[PDB]
Design an enzyme around this catalytic site. Structure first.
Site, mmCIF file in Angstrom:
data_model
loop_
_atom_site.group_PDB
_atom_site.id
_atom_site.type_symbol
_atom_site.label_atom_id
_atom_site.label_comp_id
_atom_site.label_asym_id
_atom_site.label_seq_id
_atom_site.Cartn_x
_atom_site.Cartn_y
_atom_site.Cartn_z
ATOM 1 N N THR E 1 0.833 -1.244 0.000
ATOM 2 C CA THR E 1 0.000 0.000 0.000
ATOM 3 C C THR E 1 0.851 1.271 0.000
ATOM 4 O OG1 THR E 1 -1.804 -1.105 1.223
ATOM 5 C CG2 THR E 1 -1.801 1.314 1.226
ATOM 6 N N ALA E 49 -7.679 -3.937 5.923
ATOM 7 C CA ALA E 49 -8.688 -3.537 4.943
ATOM 8 C C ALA E 49 -10.110 -3.480 5.422
ATOM 9 C CB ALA E 49 -8.628 -4.459 3.763
#
Ligand SMILES: [Mg+2]
Ligand SMILES: [Mg+2]
Lengths: 233, 235, 250, 240, 212, 222, 231, 244
Positions: E1, E49
């Protein structure tokens, strides 16, 4: 969190054209010690279901009491307890399956592998498995422990898929089961010669056979086997 | 004394019936439903001229697609609104959608009978819940402290309710425009109100699919009052 | 089900009276006379053993009770209420004191704990006050000998000498004439027997009178030897024979 | 737990316990709130049947809820402490989570909500107290004055009075207070507040308390001499 | 990420990558690492997430309930603190979260709050969070000014994600741009890194190490 | 020590078309190196034109599906028989999964159906509740084998227009139900060849506006 | 009189007045009818409105695919009891993979109502219910009263002027019981039955409410234009 | 059920008064008078014992005056048993404050908490209130010497001189007459005794029917001393002022 103490080995079963067969030996092992020899591991519920249990025997005996209590509870305020509103195999299984999964989810499982064999009210064959993890599955042949590894291969030669069930008679099916029990006695170190067998037929009903023995065994070839290689005498 | 959840010989709950008397003492609230929207209007009724009337909050937003007007012991409505708002938002969180106006009303009405010996007494306030959803369109509901709710094409609650309801019976038809409904609420409020109706002692609001729930400004309502007086003089 | 009585059963009336406490005191008034006298070297508490039936064995029913080795109690009023208070009083002496300080509580503090229990029955939910007045006699190292009265309200007062119950008014007057600050323990026992004869009507002997003292330490009553600091209980219940001996030289 | 429903409806649709709590407010010492153009002033009566008082330590009638909001009341004194404490805790809790002090409307709404909860909760009686809550929102110069009562209803007021003989002083304020032109200065607002109390009080000695609140946490209580000057000035203009 | 967000003259720029990995396995190239809390607030995904998703959706519900009760837009400070106080209650349980709560109000102006599963809450002008944060920081720091244009700021954020998408093995897929103004956020499209890389290489002259 | 989780193997696959959606999954159930069942379905019709599968640990998978099925039932009771939209079902499932964040359902969940515009919709979940709508998703034991193939054949990744110097991409277009089923069957036969936990049979559930249809195909049983 | 303050008190003649006052709330409620054959079971309900501007209060509630009831009295109490039945039907399905018998459904409601008639603080339910269903022993019709008494019947009716429909069904017993394999005729018989309880008002399109369950028919409710067929 | 027997102790009258609080105050008005007088250099606490008996042990007795800590004391008027419940709570609260802040508790803070407890019994719980009025006499470094009173309502106020219990009306008039601000402790001692001597229901005020206490800064340099008077010390102070 548990560890099993007194344990029961393989439970094997299959479907045939008019019903289901299930079998399990009469041994209660205490580790390598073959402690108890009069242990019945097939438990009938009504005249249309047989629950076969392997694994921990203390937990098996608990499950016996639950099933026994289930029959009592069903009979309460139920005029059709011996007719339309009798206990079906599917009801008994779903109950046990619910319990097994709830107990695993509380990190305190009933250390068992269970096979519910029976015939439904409409004549359909019922055969389904459940274990300590709450895992469930159905198949023309079902077996626990060593039975899964050794019996299923033999039983699947008779009934390999759904379409083989109508083509299989009770005589052929029972013969395969009795053969599978012999093979397990040869190869499973925690098995006994004595066993019980149950047939649930849609016509002839529940036939419970006790004190069976493995027979017609091949041992004669052992006398020729000498040493482990280079030994002659 | 006597139990809080006791039945009368006629088969009614004493406390629920007595709370209905409290609602009759409350200020008038009117709601009218159309195919162009639902209108909600209330009588503010300031107890003294020194009281700043714009702080009187008797019309209230629950969500963007649902509004609410009240009458009776208005202090009791705070927890009902708080529940309604939470119910609406919570349903959006769980289902990624707007909640049906009926489902909201039902949730509010579940609180109603949660009293006894739970809270100590029923609510002393009636609610008019107006809103829009995709399934049943524009809707108006009347939620009582009995736990019962009726859907209405139009409905008046409060001190001047029986007189206003008889007036709404004659005036309502299925082809009313929004502007027609706005004037009709003002007209009927002016009839049942003690003091003379103006923008400071009466409040209007509506809910439309496009713009959602909106409380009208005192400037906007003042023009609708002026438009109403001119139309009545015009014949 | 469940105790729905979570509210006070004792409340103030318009005149300011706490009815149930007054009525509890009335029950104490009806009760048999008991008294207590404080001497320079000891304390005496006494009462009549009102027998319910001549078939009953009045030895099995003990009106005078040991609370600690140096503290004793007697009452007037309702016997059952007294019995449970003695149970509770004995326990609180251990839980709220001996298990903390390794020694028995002083008289004034144990009395304070019993009072607290009786006060709570005056204010708590779904209970009536205790229908007894206690007289607690005791000794401790730093306060010496002491005598306390405890009423249904939970109020307690220290006394030189007093009486409670049936003929307390006459008995208190009798004690005022006889009491002085130079009384020896034997003199106080003598006065106690004289005072009690006035209120008793029927038989007056060691079998119908219950009497105990808080006096010198009793090593013979300790039950063991070997620890010099442990010298035995100052509480002693006078025997039926010991009472009759003093009734001859009366 | 004690469960009894003490606050309940009667046949005519009244909750007598809430209405009897209003009677306790009517018995209490008079309190008045007047807001000007740039300030709010809270006036309070103190009964003069109590001499030999110690005014250093005696609980003051006006209480600071935060540095920017104040609360005066009429009714049961002991009850008012419970509301003030809860309000003070909520004030700090708001600063802690929102990182901004409470608005006067929010604080009022909270206090009013507590009062309402005691009108439909088991085992409790309503608060025998009505409050006047005054102050200024953070980074705002618009004066705020709110009133609450036992039932739980609350509302904003240009000027308002509560307590005993409050109907007399409300009558005075209703003709003397102009909405179009509120007291332009601090002096004008305090004078109107003192004037209104002088309709009811008795003597303007140690019977009147005055607290002035201005924007940005600017709160100060007037002393005897400062208040006495307003009393002296008003009486001389009266003789006309 | 890789996620970033920085304050500037024209408000806030938020830029994120789109990749999601489970070990070496690339689970998704089309992930949405910007949450639309409400038309005036944005939040970024880094770490867990479901957590980011679940709790910032929940945050939007709390912000909606605030403005219903208070009849006023919730401050960025208040919104960010609702989230940080929540995760602090769960501290130790194993929540994984690194997010920038971004917004633009009247009283505050453009504001960015870094919120953490450790309970950290930091106000700041520039933030970069994720496995490829260091790569994004290098481009941001050398090119950032307060007086950037909305056009140049958007590009800087896009270019900084590209930088990280290239080098960081756990970043890439595509670039999502947002521009936060006082009247609300404005989406500025999804940009595939595969196409963007070659486009940037040619027009900018950068990435000469790589053969194209 | 007792280990509450297990691996029942198998693999699943969801593809979305223009006016339809398919959710496929093999019928094999395993533990370790043994086959439990050659035909044990794990793709279910849950009502309201929503098909669902929760592949991984079967006990958890069955529990989840059972709970969601029940969720649909109570949605009807509580909201006047309103149809549960695929997007609303997805959000609801997130709350089911995240409800056990600290003792997770060991399953990769996929649902399929039609969105409110009538267009095909596939949603996919991680074990703890994160979800995302996609055209394409493979889940389970052979997901890593099947998924890159789908990228290439469904979304036309890495495919450029011939003769355009790799400058113009192959344009995205919806696939017919006939073309989609071809890709499903080839995906599973390829997965069966190289993954031991995949085989026996293939069951596909197709979702159109007309309802839910089924198709079954044999797979290699070794 | 002195023995009606709460449900925990018996009268000198052995009556429970609070339970009887709860029974009175049912009599004030709008009429509803229940009847069955061997294949199907039908509920017919006359809905009631506040005025011409209001909706008509819904009388029928679905409990499962094979079971449901109609109500008469306090509607919120019907919502509490129906919700309980929904859970009990659902528990039977999830745990035992078994559709709850209509007889057990009655036994459960009886026992839930009884607990409210023996304890201090609580009150009896103020609603009567007609439960229909199709289970393993065919079609069924039950009548629930908040005293706790549940009764299985061929047909019945509760609410205001219910005696008219109850007499009709008592006459029609031999006819409607044998309406097997014909839904529309069994409904027609129920619509004719409820018509014996009407005064001044007649059955309109937004006034009538019908529900049916049977052998190859899930519990489904008909309102609005769907009941125009039967007027 | 049990509703039948509930007195409803925490409700309002139609006039807006708390029945049980009013009746508790009526109870307290029969209790022995207690007086507190605050001087510039100390505080006096005087209290009349309720009709004494000659056989009562006077020296080892405590009825009216109790010590809360080294700097604070209270005079009681009402039910003694009730007061002791509240006193032990007040004693614990003072020690909690000292444990937490390492400073002796300010007088008002202790008074407020004790008054808040009384308030609680009038608003919730369904129990009877405490039939007790206190006079708090104490010192701290913020306000110096302070007198307060609390009553069953849970309302408290500060005073220069105050009486509780019996004949407060007559007692307060006498205190209001002779009290002045520059007063010393020894003068306040004399005022307290003179007031009781005139308001007493007894024939003559004697040492055996009194409890007395002072809180002075009469220790050595900048520290406070509590003096609970012994029987002989009351006998002497009663002769010294010429009452006996
Ligand atoms: Mg990369
Ligand atoms: Mg193989």
């Amino acid at each position: 969190t548990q560890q099993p103490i007194v344990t029961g080995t393989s439970v094997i079963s299959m479907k045939y054209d008019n019903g289901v067969i299930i079998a399990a030996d009469n041994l209660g092992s205490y580790g390598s010690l073959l402690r108890f020899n009069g242990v019945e591991r097939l438990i009938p519920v009504g005249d249309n279901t047989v629950v076969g249990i392997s694994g921990d025997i203390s937990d098996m005996q608990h499950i016996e009491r639950l099933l026994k209590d289930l029959v009592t509870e069903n009979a309460y305020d139920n005029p059709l307890a011996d007719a339309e509103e009798a206990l079906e195999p599917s009801y008994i299984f779903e109950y046990l399956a619910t319990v097994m999964y709830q107990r695993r989810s509380k990190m305190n499982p009933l250390w068992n592998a269970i096979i519910v064999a029976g015939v439904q009210s409409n004549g359909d064959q019922f055969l389904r498995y459940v274990n300590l993890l709450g895992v469930t599955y159905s198949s023309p042949t079902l077996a626990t422990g060593f039975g899964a590894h050794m019996a299923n291969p033999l039983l699947r030669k008779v009934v390999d898929r759904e379409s083989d069930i109508p083509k299989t008679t009770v005589q052929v099916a029972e013969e395969a089961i009795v053969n599978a029990m012999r093979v397990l006695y040869y190869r499973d170190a925690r098995s006994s010669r004595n066993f019980s067998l149950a047939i649930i037929d849609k016509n002839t009903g529940l036939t419970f056979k006790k004190n069976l023995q493995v027979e017609n065994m091949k041992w004669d070839f052992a006398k020729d086997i000498k040493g482990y290689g280079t030994q002659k005498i | 004394d006597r139990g809080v959840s006791t039945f009368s010989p006629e088969g009614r709950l004493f406390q629920v019936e007595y709370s209905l008397e409290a609602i009759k003492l409350g200020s008038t609230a009117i709601g009218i439903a159309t195919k162009e929207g639902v209108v909600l209007g209330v009588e503010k009724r300031a107890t003294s001229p020194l009281l700043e009337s714009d702080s009187i909050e008797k019309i209230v937003e629950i969500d963007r697609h649902i509004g609410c007007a009240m009458s009776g012991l208005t202090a009791d409505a705070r927890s009902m609104i708080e529940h309604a708002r939470t119910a609406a938002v919570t349903h959006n969180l769980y289902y990624d959608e707007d909640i049906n106006v009926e489902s909201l009303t039902q949730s509010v009405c579940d609180l109603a009978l949660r009293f006894g010996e739970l809270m100590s007494r029923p609510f002393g306030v009636a609610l008019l819940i107006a809103g829009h959803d995709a399934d049943d369109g524009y809707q108006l509901f009347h939620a009582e402290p009995s736990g019962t709710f009726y859907r209405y094409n139009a409905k008046a609650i409060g001190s001047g309710s029986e007189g206003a309801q008889a007036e709404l019976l004659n005036e309502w038809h299925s082809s009313l425009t929004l502007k027609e409904a706005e004037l009709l609420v003002l007209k009927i409020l002016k009839q049942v109100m003690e003091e003379k109706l103006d923008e400071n002692n009466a409040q209007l609001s509506c809910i439309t699919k496009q713009d959602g729930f909106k409380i009208y400004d005192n400037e906007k309502t003042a023009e609708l009052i002026k438009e109403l007086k001119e139309k009545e003089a015009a014949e | 089900m469940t105790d729905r009585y979570s509210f006070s059963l004792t409340t103030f009336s318009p005149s300011g009276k706490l009815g149930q406490i007054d009525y509890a005191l009335t029950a104490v008034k009806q009760g048999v006379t008991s008294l207590g006298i404080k001497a320079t070297n000891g304390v005496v508490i006494a009462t009549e053993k009102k027998s319910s039936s001549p078939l009953a064995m009045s030895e099995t029913l003990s009106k005078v009770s040991l609370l600690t080795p140096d503290i004793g109690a007697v009452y007037s009023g309702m016997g059952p209420d007294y019995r449970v208070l003695v149970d509770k009083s004995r326990k609180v002496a251990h839980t709220s004191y001996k298990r903390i300080y390794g020694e028995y509580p002083p008289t004034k503090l144990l009395v304070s704990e019993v009072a607290k229990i009786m006060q709570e029955a005056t204010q708590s939910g779904g209970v009536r006050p205790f229908g007894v007045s206690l007289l607690i006699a005791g000794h401790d190292e730093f306060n010496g000998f002491s005598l306390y009265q405890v009423d249904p309200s939970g109020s307690y007062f220290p006394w030189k000498a007093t009486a409670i119950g049936k003929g307390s008014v006459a008995a208190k007057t009798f004690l005022e004439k006889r009491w002085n600050d130079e009384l020896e323990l034997e003199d106080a026992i003598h006065i106690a027997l004289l005072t009690l004869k006035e209120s008793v009507e029927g038989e007056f002997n060691g079998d119908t009178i219950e009497l105990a003292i808080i006096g010198d330490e009793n090593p013979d009553l300790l039950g063991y030897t070997g620890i010099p600091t442990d010298k035995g209980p100052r509480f002693r219940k006078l025997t039926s024979q010991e009472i009759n001996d003093r009734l001859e030289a009366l | 737990g004690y469960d009894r429903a003490l606050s309940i409806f009667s046949p005519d649709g009244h909750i007598f316990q809430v209405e009897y709590a209003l009677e306790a407010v009517k018995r209490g010492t008079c309190a008045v709130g007047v807001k000007g153009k740039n300030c709010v002033v809270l006036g309070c009566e103190r009964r003069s049947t109590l001499k030999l008082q110690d005014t250093r330590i005696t609980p003051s009638k006006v209480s600071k809820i935060d540095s920017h909001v104040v609360l005066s009341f009429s009714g049961l004194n002991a009850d008012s402490r419970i509301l003030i404490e809860k309000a003070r805790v909520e004030a700090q809790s708001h600063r802690l989570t929102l990182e901004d002090p409470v608005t006067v409307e929010y604080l009022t709404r909270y206090v009013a909500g507590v009062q309402q909860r005691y009108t439909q909760s088991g085992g409790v009686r309503p608060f025998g107290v009505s409050t006047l809550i005054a102050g200024f929102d953070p980074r705002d110069d618009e004066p705020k004055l709110y009133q609450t009562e036992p039932s739980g209803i609350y509302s904003s007021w240009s000027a308002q009075t509560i307590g005993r003989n409050s109907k007399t002083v409300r009558e005075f304020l209703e003709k003397n207070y102009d909405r179009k032109e509120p007291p332009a200065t601090v002096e004008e607002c305090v004078k109107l507040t003192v004037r209104s109390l002088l309709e009811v009080v008795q003597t303007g000695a140690k019977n009147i308390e005055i607290t002035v609140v201005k924007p940005d946490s600017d709160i100060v209580a007037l002393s005897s001499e400062e208040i006495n000057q307003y009393v002296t000035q008003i009486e001389q203009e009266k003789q006309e | 990420t890789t996620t970033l967000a920085f304050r500037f003259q024209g408000g806030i720029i938020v830029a994120v990558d789109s990749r999601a990995t489970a070990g070496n396995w690339v689970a998704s190239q089309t992930v949405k690492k910007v949450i639309e809390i409400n038309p005036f607030l944005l939040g970024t995904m880094a770490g867990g997430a479901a957590d980011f998703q679940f709790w910032e959706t929940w945050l939007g519900s709390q912000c909606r309930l605030h403005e219903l009760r208070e009849k006023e837009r919730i401050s960025v400070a208040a919104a960010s603190k609702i989230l940080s106080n929540l995760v602090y209650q769960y501290k130790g349980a194993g929540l994984s979260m690194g997010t920038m709560i971004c917004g633009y109000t009247r009283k505050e102006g453009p504001t960015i709050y870094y919120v953490d599963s450790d309970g950290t809450r930091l106000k700041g002008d520039i933030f970069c969070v994720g496995s490829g944060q260091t790569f994004a920081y290098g481009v941001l720091d050398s090119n950032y000014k307060w007086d950037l244009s909305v056009e140049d700021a958007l590009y800087l954020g896009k270019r900084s994600i590209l930088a990280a998408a290239h080098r960081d093995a756990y970043s890439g897929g595509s670039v999502n741009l947002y521009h936060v103004t006082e009247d609300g956020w404005i989406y500025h499209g999804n940009h595939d890194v595969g196409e963007l890389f070659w486009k940037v290489k040619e027009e900018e002259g950068s990435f000469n190490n790589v053969i194209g | 020590q007792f280990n509450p989780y297990g691996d029942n193997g198998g693999t699943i696959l969801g593809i979305a078309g223009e006016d339809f959606a398919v959710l496929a999954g093999d019928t094999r159930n395993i533990t370790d190196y043994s086959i439990n069942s050659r035909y044990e379905p794990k793709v279910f019709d849950c009502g309201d034109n929503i098909v669902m599968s929760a592949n991984g640990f079967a006990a958890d998978g069955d529990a989840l599906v059972k709970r969601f099925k029940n969720s649909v039932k109570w949605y009807h009771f509580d909201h006047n028989d309103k149809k549960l939209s695929i997007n609303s079902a997805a959000r609801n499932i997130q709350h089911l999964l995240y409800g056990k964040r600290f003792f997770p359902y060991y399953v990769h969940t996929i649902i399929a159906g039609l969105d409110e515009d009538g267009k095909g919709a596939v949603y996919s979940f991680d074990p703890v509740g994160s979800y995302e709508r996609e055209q394409c998703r493979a889940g389970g034991a052979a997901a890593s084998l099947i998924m890159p193939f789908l990228d290439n054949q469904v979304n036309f990744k890495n495919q450029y227009e011939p003769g355009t110097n790799g400058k113009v991409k192959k344009p995205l277009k919806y696939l017919s139900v006939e073309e989609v089923i071809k890709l499903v069957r080839d995906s599973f036969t390829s997965a069966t060849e190289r993954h031991i936990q995949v085989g026996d049979g293939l069951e596909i559930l197709i979702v159109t506006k007309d309802g839910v249809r089924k198709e079954f195909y044999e797979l290699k049983r070794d | 009189n002195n023995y009606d303050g709460d449900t925990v008190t018996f009268s000198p003649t052995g009556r429970l007045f609070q339970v009887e006052y709860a029974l009175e709330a049912i009599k004030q409620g709008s009429v509803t009818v229940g009847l069955r054959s061997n294949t199907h079971a039908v509920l017919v309900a006359l809905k009631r409105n506040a005025d011409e501007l209001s909706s008509y209060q819904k009388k029928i509630i679905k409990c499962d695919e094979h079971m449901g009831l109609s109500l008469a009295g306090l509607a919120p109490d019907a919502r509490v009891l129906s919700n309980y039945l929904r859970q009990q039907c659902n528990y039977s399905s999830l745990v035992f993979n078994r559709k709850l018998a209509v007889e057990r459904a009655g036994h459960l409601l009886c026992d839930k109502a009884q607990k409210n008639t023996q304890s201090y603080g609580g009150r009896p339910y103020g609603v009567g219910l007609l439960i229909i269903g199709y289970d393993k022993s065919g079609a069924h019709l039950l009548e629930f009263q908040p005293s706790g008494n549940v009764t299985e019947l061929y047909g019945t009716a509760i609410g205001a002027r219910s005696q008219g429909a109850k007499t009709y069904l008592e006459r029609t017993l031999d006819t409607f019981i044998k309406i097997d394999g014909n839904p529309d005729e069994l409904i027609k018989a129920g619509v004719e039955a409820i018509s014996q309880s009407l005064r001044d008002e007649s059955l309109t399109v937004d006034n009538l409410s019908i529900a049916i369950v049977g052998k190859d028919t899930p519990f489904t409710i008909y309102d609005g234009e769907a009941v125009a067929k039967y007027i | 059920g049990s509703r039948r027997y509930d007195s409803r102790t925490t409700i309002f009258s139609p006039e807006g008064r708390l029945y049980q609080v009013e009746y508790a105050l009526e109870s307290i008005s029969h209790a022995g008078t207690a007086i507190g007088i605050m001087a510039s250099d100390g505080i006096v606490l005087a209290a009349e014992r309720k009709v004494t008996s000659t056989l009562l042990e006077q020296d080892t007795s405590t009825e009216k005056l109790y010590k809360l800590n080294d700097k604070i004391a209270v005079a009681v008027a009402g039910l003694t048993a009730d007061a002791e419940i509240l006193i032990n709570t007040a004693r614990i609260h003072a020690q909690n404050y000292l444990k937490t802040y390492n400073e002796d508790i300010p007088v008002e803070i202790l008074v407020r908490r004790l008054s808040d407890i009384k308030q609680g019994y009038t608003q919730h719980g369904g129990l009877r209130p405490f039939g007790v009025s206190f006079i708090y006499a104490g010192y701290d470094d913020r306000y110096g010497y302070q007198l307060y009173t609390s009553n069953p309502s849970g309302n408290y106020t500060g005073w220069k001189a105050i009486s509780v219990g019996a004949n407060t009306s007559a007692a307060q008039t006498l205190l209001q007459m002779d009290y002045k601000d520059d007063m010393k402790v020894d003068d306040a001692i004399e005022l307290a005794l003179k007031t009781l001597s005139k308001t007493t229901d007894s024939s003559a005020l004697t040492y055996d029917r009194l409890e007395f206490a002072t809180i002075r800064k009469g220790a050595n340099d900048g520290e406070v001393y509590q003096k609970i008077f012994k029987p002989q010390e009351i006998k002497d102070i009663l002769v010294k002022t010429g009452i006996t």
